[PDB]
Design a protein around this ligand. Structure first.
Ligand code: CYC
Ligand code: CYC
Ligand code: CYC
Ligand code: CYC
Ligand code: CYC
Ligand code: CYC
Ligand code: CYC
Ligand code: CYC
Lengths: 162, 172, 162, 162, 172, 162
C-alpha cells in the first residue's frame, strides 16, 4: 500500500526517529494533490458505466477474433462478456481507488501483484487490457492537472501490464 | 428516393409549416455525424467483393443443396446470377447508408424482389440467411479501427444492421 | 428532388457501380454547405412573417392596379390578400426548404413544375412573384456565403418564373 | 472518365438544365479533395521506383513458382521481369493519375475495362496484381486522409480485379 | 468531354510518363484559382435570362430584317426556337467555363451547328453577332463586383472571351 | 441449348415457314452423328472414374503449388480435393452430355455461361481446368471419328475457358 503518508511513516519508523519537516512537506504536497484528486475521482465515478461499455466495445473492435472463436477465455458467449466487463469495471474502480488514495498502492495490491501469472494461466492477453486502458485514458474527459495524473495512473497500469 | 434532409422537408411540408428548431438541431447533429456515417460507408465499400465472396463461401458451405445438382444455384449461369443478386443487394445497402434513408433500398429492391424469388422458384430462406451473414460480416469489417482515429460508430452500427435486417426481412 | 446525395446515388446506380471517392467529395462539400445553410434557414424562419408582409406591400406598391380593379385574380378584396400572402409564404417556405435540402429540388417539385400553366390558366402575372422574390432577396438581411447562396436560390426561382 | 466535374456536367446536360448549387457543392468538395491529393500524388511520384521494385519482389516472394517454371506468361526469364515490372509501374501510374483526376475514371478507362479478358487470354492470374497492390497500399507511407483515399483507389483496383 | 485535370492526364498518358512537376504547379495554381473561376461562373449563371433577353433585344433592334415578315426569326415559333438556340449556347459556355476546358463546348455544339444553320437557312452572321454581343454583356456583367470580396476576374476574362469567340467563330 | 434439331426448328420458326428439305438433311446428318456418338458416350461413361482421378493427379502434377499453399481456393486440404474432383467430374459429365445431345448446348448452358465470373470471384485459375481437359482429351482412349468429335467438344471447352 504505497501511499505517501504511509511511506513517510515507514521511513520515519525504519530510521527510528521522530517526524521531521520532510514529512510535513510530504503532507502539504499530498493535501495539494487530494484537493483536486477527490473531485476528479467523483467525476470518474459519475462517468464510469459509459466508460466501461465504451472500453469493452473498443476492445471488441480492435480484437474482433475474441467475439468469434469458441473458447471460455474469449468473450464469444454472454458469460464472457459479463465477466469481461466486470474486469473492465475492476480496472476502472482501481483507478478511482488510486485517485482517492493518492498513490499507486491500491492497484499494486489489488491488480498488479498477480496479474502476470493470472494472464499466463488463463490465456488472457494483456494487450486487451492495454487497449481498454488506452480507451479509458482517451475518453475520461477530465482536464488539467487532474487529467494528467489520472493519465499517469493509467499509464502506470499499462506499463505494469506490458 | 429520399435523403434525410428531403425526408424532413417532406414531413415539414405535409405539416405545412416551417421546420421546427429541434429537427434543425437533429439535422445539425446529423451533419456532424454524416461524415461519421461515411467512414463506415467507405470502409464498407472497399471490401465489397471480399464480402460477397465470403458470404457465398459460408452460405454454400452451409447449404450444400444449392450446389447439389438440381439445386437452385447449381448451374454455372445460375450461380453467377446468384452472386450478381447478392452484390446488387449489398450495393443498394451501401446506397441507403450513403443517403441515410431506407427509402432508396425499398425503392430499388424490396417490393419486387420477394415476388421475383417466388416466381423464379428461388428459395427466399437461403438468400435471407446470406444477406444476414453478409450484414454480420459487413458490420464486423466496419467496426474494426485499423489505421483510423478513435471515434464512436455506435448509432451507425445500429443503422447499418437496421438496413440489413430490412433487406433480409423484405426478401423472406 | 435534385439534392446532391440523391443525385450522387442516382449516378452510381445508373452506372451500375459502387460509390467512389467522387461521391465522398460531394459529401464533404455538402456538409460544408449545410454547416452554414441550416443556421441561415433558421434565421429566415425567424424573419419570415415580416418578410412576407413586406413582399406583399412591395408587390402592391409596384403594381397598384391589382388593388383597384375588380377581379378574382386580383387582390382587390380581402380573400385575394389572404390567398396572395399565402402564396408569398409558400414561396418563402420553398426557399427555406431548398436551403435545408441543399439543392433546388424542393422548389422544382413543389413550385416550378406546373407554375407556368397555373399562371396561364388563372391570369396571374409571374412578374408579381418576381417583384416579391426581388424584395425578399433584397431584404432577407443575411450576410456572407449563406446570403450569396440564398440569393442563388431566389434568382433560380426568378429565372424559372420568367 | 468518371471525374466529379465531368459527371456534374453530364448530369446537368442530361437533365437539360443550367448548373445549380449542387454542382458548386460538388466543386468546393472537389477542391477540398485536390488540396491534399495533388501533394500526395507528388509524394507517390517521388517514392514510385522503390515501390515498384518492392511490389515486384513481394510478388515473386508470395508466388515463387512464377520465377521457376518455363513459360512466357511467367517471369522466369528476364523479359518477363521487364514486362512484369512495367505493368507494376503501369498500375502505380494509374493510381497517381486517379489521385490527380479525383476519381476512378483514369484507371477505369486505362486498366479495368479490358483487364479480365486480357488475363483470360494471357494466362495471367489477377492475384499477382492483387498482391502487388496490397504491397503498394501497405508500403506507400502516406498519412491521414490522403492515405485513406489512396487506399480507397487501390482497394477499388483490387475489387475490380477479383 | 474533358476537364483540366483529365486534359493533363490524357497528355501525360500520351507521353507515357508520369506528370512533370511544372504541370503539377500549374494545376496547383489552377486549384487555387478554380474557385476564382467558380465565383465568376456563378455570377454569370444567375443573370442568364436577362443576358439572353438583352442579347436578342439588341440583336433584333440591330437587324430588323429577322423580325420582318419572311425573315428567319419572324414566326413566333421560330422566334422561340431562336431564343432557345441562344440560351443553349450560353448554357454550354457556362459548362465549358465550369470544367475549365473548351472540349465540352466543342463536343456539344460546334461541329454540327454550323451545318445545321446552313441546312436550315439560318443566317450564321446574325447568330454570330448575337453570341458576340451576349459574350460582351456576359463579361460586362461578370467583371463588376457587388458585395463580393475583391478578386482578379481578369485571368477568367481572357478565358471567357476565348470561349465566346470560339463559339462565335464555330457558328460563323 | 444449341442442338441441331432445336436450332433447325428455331430457324423454321423465325422464318415463319414449314420444314423443308434442309432440316431433313440436318436430320440424316444428326442421325449419322448419333449412330457412333451414343456408343462413344457409353464408353466414356465406363472410363469416367479413372479419367477423373488421372486428370486430378495431372493437375496436381503440373501445378504443385496448389497442393502446398494454405488457401480455401487451393486443394491443399481434403475438402478442396473433394470439391476439386467434383468439378472434374462435372466437366467430364458435361462432355458426355454434349456427346449425347449432339451439340455444344449442354456445356454452354451448364458450364460456359458463367464460368468466367466464377473463376474471377473465386480466385480459380482456368488453366487448371485447361490442363485437366487436355489430360482427358489425351487419355480418353477412343478411336476414329468419335474420338475426333470428342476432342472437338473438349477443345471447345478449352477455347471457352481461355
Ligand atoms: C474482457 C475485459 C476481456 C476478457 C476478460 C476475462 N477475464 C476473465 C477471467 C478472470 N479475470 C480476472 C481478472 C481480475 N480479477 C480481479 O479480481 C481483478 C482486479 C479487481 C482483475 C483484473 C480473474 C482473476 C479471472 C479468473 C476468475 C474466473 O475465472 O472467473 C474471463 C472469464 C474467463 C475465465 O474462465 O477464466 C474473461 C472473459 N476476456 C476477453 O475476451 C475480453 C477481451
Ligand atoms: C443467391 C443469394 C440466391 C439466388 C439468387 C438468384 N437470383 C436469380 C435470378 C434473378 N434475380 C433477380 C433479382 C433482382 N433483379 C434486380 O434487378 C434486382 C434489384 C435491382 C434484384 C434483387 C431477377 C430479376 C432474376 C431473374 C432474371 C435474371 O438474370 O437474373 C437466379 C437465377 C435463376 C435463373 O433461372 O436464372 C439465382 C440463382 N438464388 C439462390 O439459389 C440463392 C437463394
Ligand atoms: C467507424 C466505424 C470508426 C471511426 C471513424 C471516424 N471517422 C472520423 C472522422 C473522419 N473520418 C474521415 C475520413 C475521410 N474523409 C475524407 O474526405 C475521406 C475520403 C473519402 C475519408 C476516408 C475524416 C476526414 C474525418 C473528419 C475530418 C478529418 O479527419 O480530417 C471520426 C471522428 C470525427 C468525425 O466525426 O468525423 C471517427 C470516430 N472511429 C472509430 O472509432 C470507429 C471504429
Ligand atoms: C399575391 C401574392 C398575388 C396574387 C396571388 C394569387 N394566387 C391565387 C391563386 C393560386 N395561387 C396558387 C399558387 C401556389 N399554390 C401552391 O401550392 C404553391 C407552392 C406551394 C404556389 C405558388 C395556386 C395553385 C392557385 C389556385 C388555387 C386557388 O384558386 O385558390 C389567388 C386567388 C385567385 C384565384 O381564384 O385563383 C391570388 C389572389 N394575386 C395578386 O393579385 C397578387 C399580386
Ligand atoms: C496501363 C495499364 C496496362 C496493364 C495492366 C497491361 C498489362 C499487360 N500485360 C501483358 C503481359 C504480361 N504481363 C506480365 C506480368 C506478370 N507476369 C508475372 O509472372 C508477374 C507475376 C507479373 C509481373 C507484374 C508479363 C510477364 C507479361 C508478358 C507475357 C506476355 O507475352 O503476354 C500484356 C500483353 C502485352 C504483351 O504481351 O506484351 C498486357 C496488355 N497493359 C497495359 O497497358
Ligand atoms: C445542343 C446544341 C444544339 C444547337 C446549337 C441546336 C440548333 C438548332 N436550331 C434549330 C432552329 C432554329 N435556330 C434558330 C436561331 C436563329 N436563327 C435566326 O434567325 C438567328 C440568326 C438565330 C437566333 C440566334 C431559329 C429561328 C430556328 C428555327 C428554324 C425553324 O424552326 O424553321 C434547329 C432545328 C430544329 C428545331 O429547333 O426545333 C436545331 C437542331 N440544336 C441543338 O440541339
Ligand atoms: C456554390 C455556392 C458558393 C458560392 C457562390 C461561393 C462563393 C464564394 N466566393 C468566395 C470568395 C471570392 N469570390 C470572389 C469573386 C470575385 N471578386 C471580384 O472582385 C471579381 C469581379 C469576382 C470574380 C469575377 C473573390 C475575389 C473572392 C475572394 C476570396 C476567395 O479567393 O475565395 C468565397 C470564399 C468563402 C466565403 O466567402 O465565405 C465564397 C464562399 N461559395 C460557395 O460555397
Ligand atoms: C456443372 C458445372 C460446374 C462447375 C465447373 C462448377 C465449379 C465451381 N467450383 C467451385 C469451387 C471450387 N473449385 C475448386 C477446384 C479446384 N481448385 C483447385 O485447387 C484444383 C486445381 C481444382 C480441382 C478441379 C475447388 C477446390 C473449389 C472450392 C473452393 C471454394 O470455396 O470456392 C464453385 C463455388 C461453389 C463452392 O464454393 O463450393 C463452383 C460454382 N460448378 C458447377 O456447377
Amino acid at each position: 500500500m504505497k501511499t505517501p503518508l504511509t511511506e513517510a511513516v515507514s521511513i520515519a519508523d525504519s530510521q527510528g526517529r521522530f517526524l521531521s519537516s520532510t514529512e510535513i512537506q510530504v503532507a502539504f504536497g499530498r493535501f495539494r494533490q487530494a484537493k483536486a484528486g477527490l473531485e476528479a475521482a467523483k467525476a470518474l465515478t459519475s462517468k464510469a458505466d459509459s466508460l466501461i461499455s465504451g472500453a469493452a466495445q473498443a476492445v471488441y473492435n480492435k480484437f474482433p477474433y475474441t467475439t468469434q472463436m469458441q473458447g471460455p477465455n474469449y468473450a464469444a458467449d454472454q458469460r464472457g462478456k459479463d465477466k469481461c466487463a466486470r474486469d473492465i469495471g475492476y480496472y476502472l474502480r482501481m483507478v478511482t481507488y488510486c485517485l482517492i488514495a493518492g498513490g499507486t498502492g491500491p492497484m499494486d495490491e489489488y491488480l498488479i501483484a498477480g496479474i502476470d501469472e493470472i494472464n499466463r494461466t488463463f490465456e488472457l492477453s494483456p494487450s486487451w487490457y492495454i487497449e481498454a486502458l488506452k480507451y479509458i485514458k482517451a475518453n475520461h474527459g477530465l482536464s488539467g492537472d487532474a487529467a494528467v495524473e489520472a493519465n499517469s495512473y493509467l499509464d502506470y497500469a499499462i506499463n505494469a501490464l506490458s | 428516393m429520399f435523403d434525410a434532409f428531403t425526408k424532413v422537408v417532406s414531413q415539414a411540408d405535409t405539416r405545412g409549416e416551417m421546420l421546427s428548431t429541434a429537427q434543425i438541431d437533429a439535422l445539425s447533429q446529423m451533419v456532424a455525424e454524416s461524415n461519421k456515417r461515411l467512414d463506415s460507408v467507405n470502409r464498407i465499400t472497399s471490401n465489397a467483393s471480399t464480402i460477397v465472396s465470403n458470404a457465398a463461401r459460408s452460405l454454400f458451405a452451409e447449404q450444400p443443396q444449392l450446389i447439389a445438382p438440381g439445386g437452385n444455384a447449381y448451374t454455372s449461369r445460375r450461380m453467377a446470377a446468384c452472386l450478381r443478386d447478392m452484390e446488387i443487394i449489398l450495393r443498394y445497402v451501401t446506397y441507403a447508408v450513403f443517403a441515410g434513408d431506407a427509402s432508396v433500398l425499398e425503392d430499388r429492391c424490396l417490393n419486387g424482389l420477394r415476388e421475383t424469388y417466388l416466381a423464379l422458384g428461388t428459395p427466399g430462406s437461403s438468400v435471407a440467411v446470406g444477406v444476414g451473414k453478409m450484414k454480420e460480416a459487413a458490420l464486423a469489417i466496419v467496426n474494426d479501427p485499423a489505421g483510423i482515429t478513435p471515434g464512436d460508430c455506435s448509432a451507425l452500427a445500429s443503422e447499418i444492421a437496421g438496413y440489413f435486417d430490412r433487406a433480409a426481412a423484405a426478401v423472406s
